[PDB]
Amino acid sequence: RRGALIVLEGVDRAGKSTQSRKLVEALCAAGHRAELLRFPERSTEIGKLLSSYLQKKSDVEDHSVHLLFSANRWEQVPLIKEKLSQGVTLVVDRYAFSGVAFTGAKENFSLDWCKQPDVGLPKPDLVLFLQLQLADAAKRGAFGHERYENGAFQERALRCFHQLMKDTTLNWKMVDASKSIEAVHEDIRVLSEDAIATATEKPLGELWK
Amino acid sequence: RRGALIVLEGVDRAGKSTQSRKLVEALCAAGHRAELLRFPERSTEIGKLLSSYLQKKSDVEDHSVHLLFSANRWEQVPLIKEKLSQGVTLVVDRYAFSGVAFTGAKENFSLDWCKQPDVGLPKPDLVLFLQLQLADAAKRGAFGHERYENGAFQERALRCFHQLMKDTTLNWKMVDASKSIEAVHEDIRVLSEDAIATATEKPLGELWK
Ligand SMILES: Nc1ncnc2c1ncn2[C@@H]1O[C@H](COP(=O)(O)OP(=O)(O)NP(=O)(O)O)[C@@H](O)[C@H]1O
Numbered sequence: 474r475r476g477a478l479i480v481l482e483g484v485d486r487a488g489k490s491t492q493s494r495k496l497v498e499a500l501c502a503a504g505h506r507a508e509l510l511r512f513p514e515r516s517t518e519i520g521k522l523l524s525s526y527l528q529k530k531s532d533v534e535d536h537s538v539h540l541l542f543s544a545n546r547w548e549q550v551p552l553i554k555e556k557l558s559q560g561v562t563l564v565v566d567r568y569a570f571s572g573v574a575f576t577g578a579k580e581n582f583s584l585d586w587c588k589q590p591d592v593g594l595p596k597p598d599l600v601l602f603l604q605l606q607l608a609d610a611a612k613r614g615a616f617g618h619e620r621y622e623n624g625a626f627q628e629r630a631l632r633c634f635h636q637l638m639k640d641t642t643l644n645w646k647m648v649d650a651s652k653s654i655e656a657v658h659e660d661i662r663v664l665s666e667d668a669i670a671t672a673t674e675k676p677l678g679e680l681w682k
Numbered sequence: 683r684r685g686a687l688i689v690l691e692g693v694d695r696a697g698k699s700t701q702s703r704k705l706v707e708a709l710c711a712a713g714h715r716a717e718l719l720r721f722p723e724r725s726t727e728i729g730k731l732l733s734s735y736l737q738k739k740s741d742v743e744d745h746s747v748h749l750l751f752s753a754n755r756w757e758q759v760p761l762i763k764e765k766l767s768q769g770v771t772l773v774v775d776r777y778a779f780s781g782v783a784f785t786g787a788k789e790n791f792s793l794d795w796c797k798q799p800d801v802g803l804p805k806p807d808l809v810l811f812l813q814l815q816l817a818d819a820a821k822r823g824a825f826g827h828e829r830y831e832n833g834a835f836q837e838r839a840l841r842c843f844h845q846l847m848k849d850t851t852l853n854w855k856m857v858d859a860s861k862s863i864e865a866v867h868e869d870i871r872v873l874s875e876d877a878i879a880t881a882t883e884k885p886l887g888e889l890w891k
Pocket residue numbers: 483484485486487488489490491492613614650651652653654657
């Protein structure tokens with residue numbers, strides 16, 4: 474019985490990392506085999522270049538960094554397929570949607586061109602989108618010093634996210650991320666239990682293909 | 683007056699590097715401003731990963747290495763556009779065609795998926811293809827120990843090359859690379875002088891777009 478591939482997406486500070494950690498903990502406490510993955514995955518050679526870029530320790534041409542983000546997902550595909558075939562559910566903090574939304578937010582980058590590198594990746598069985606007002610997300614303390622952490626850019630990324638949601642080949646679920654950590658968690662948990670059960674009766678699909 | 687973007691392609695051992703070096707030398711001796719570029723460009727962080735892969739000092743998932751090859755071209759785009767706008771002709775030893783032919787030679791890689799990352803790159807004004815029998819290319823000493831240096835794979839890459847040649851948006855010129863170094867050089871040189879002159883009256887295009 475394969476595991477489910479569940480992705481958490483949203484703008485910066487929507488609660489993705491807190492909710493991904495809490496989900497894996499709750500699923501394992503409920504007897505599921507579940508593990509956490511995140512993108513970018515900074516531990517690889519590619520991920521190190523991406524971390525340096527995000528921290529502005531380095532500058533990378535926009536097309537080149539978009540491709541490195543996608544390559545960073547493909548390098549984990551063998552692992553992802555192996556885990557899911559063993560019955561392990563994978564909870565993923567950001568995936569190809571973030572890749573398209575962030576580059577697509579820059580001038581002169583079509584959503585079409587941004588999607589291509591990720592075409593064929595393992596298709597998530599469930600894509601949770603943690604919806605929150607950009608304003609309420611900024612009330613969450615304050616902006617960090619990483620690339621893209623500014624209001625204007627976040628608003629353009631959000632717009633791109635909404636375009637990808639029109640894709641009904643994907644099981645998108647909206648989450649009200651403005652609620653308490655525990656309330657948001659319970660919403661996410663119940664959606665996730667359903668996917669693990671029922672979304673997996675079919676073979677793992679291929680994204681945007 | 684912009685410079686021309688001339689690319690040399692062909693299978694391994696077709697003479698690309700010898701002919702690219704000789705072309706730049708002859709063009710500069712004839713008063714042109716011309717410089718040599720090559721792909722992969724191993725001097726960058728990306729290029730170092732690619733060199734390690736090619737030498738089999740490392741293994742990289744096939745989709746991920748295809749994207750790193752393309753990223754390695756995009757990281758040079760600002761330089762390429764700057765040089766060409768200054769009137770410098772650029773002679774390039776391998777480009778996106780090699781990228782598509784080599785990955786497209788592997789199982790389960792569509793030419794369409796392989797082309798996407800490079801869509802939008804600076805479009806070559808002239809693409810020279812150094813045609814030589816795979817057999818005569820092997821009579822050129824012997825195979826090196828790098829990845830892909832085997833007959834079966836070379837034959838599949840050649841097939842992919844022939845598919846890309848059906849693209850009439852590109853100024854492809856076949857060269858008989860079985861001739862002497864000097865004879866092949868003179869053919870390439872005269873084709874190149876013509877492109878520099880006449881192919882550049884129009885703005886630099888965008889590849890596969
Ligand atoms: N529901 C919530 N209500 C209030 N604060 C929250 C909530 N969820 C998370 N936070 C806090 O907001 C901050 C950002 O949470 P985090 O889970 O790291 O968001 P994120 O979406 O992963 N951010 P990023 O990696 O920058 O896109 C942390 O201090 C969290 O403790």
